[model samples]
Target: AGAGKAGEGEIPAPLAGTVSKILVKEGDTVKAGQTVLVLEAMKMETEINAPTDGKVEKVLVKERDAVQGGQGLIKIG
Candidate 1:
């Protein structure tokens, strides 16, 4: 949930999992493929990355929160 429209970049979860850690904070500039957070599901960890270079505008999930695949996690501007 909390997906954004065009012009607001949506950094979505690549798979369903619990948000394990947040690597970047709001206003942090990240590069493509930069790890912004970590997800844990099925005993494995998935590192969430930025799809494009931009500054993080918001973090939508907190640590240990469950998220669905393709669910928006952060906003990049």
Candidate 2:
């Protein structure tokens, strides 16, 4: 089910989880496959990566924030 919507350039959570850590900050440039954050779900850690090369425009979730699958976690520009 769709909970929160991710806008254009927004990086979405691939699964329901708690935000474990943020590896990048706003204004940071990231390449595709670069991990921007870490998520903990089902006792496993997931790396949230950039879909494309872009500057980090916003960090939408903080450490320990609970997020649903497809929820927006960051924004790139």
Candidate 3:
């Protein structure tokens, strides 16, 4: 992620998890605190929210895709 305004377009994972559902798609605009995706790990489903008002630029993984800690699930612009 490039340096810019804090939370301007950063969407980071809080922990390791498998992607459950992608709530937004590429080019889709989302608001701050909006749920962007859901992840399942250790029998828990966590809703990931957008950090700021921005458009989805990429979905790095898909449903059922496993991801590691600090792994980016989505990127916004």
Candidate 2, residue 4: Cα displacement in angstroms equals: 0.7
Error of 1 at 68 (Å): 0.7
Q: Evaluate residue 7 in candidate 1 and report its C-alpha lDDT on the 0 to 100 scale.
A: 31
The lDDT per prediction is 0.82, 0.87, 0.77
Residue pairs in steric clash, candidate 2?
A: none
- Per-residue lDDT tens digits of candidate 2, residues 1-77? 66786757787779889999999898788998999999999999999988888988888889989988888888988
Off by over 4 Å in 2: none
Candidate 2 has a TM-score of 0.91
Highest-lDDT candidate: 2
Candidate topping TM-score: 2
Model 3 misplacement above 4 A = 1-10
TM-score, per-candidate, Cα-based:
0.86, 0.91, 0.81
lDDT of 2: 0.87
RMSD of each: 3.0, 1.6, 4.5
- Writing each residue's lDDT as its tens digit, candidate 3 over 23-74 gives 9999789888999999998999998888777888877769988876566667
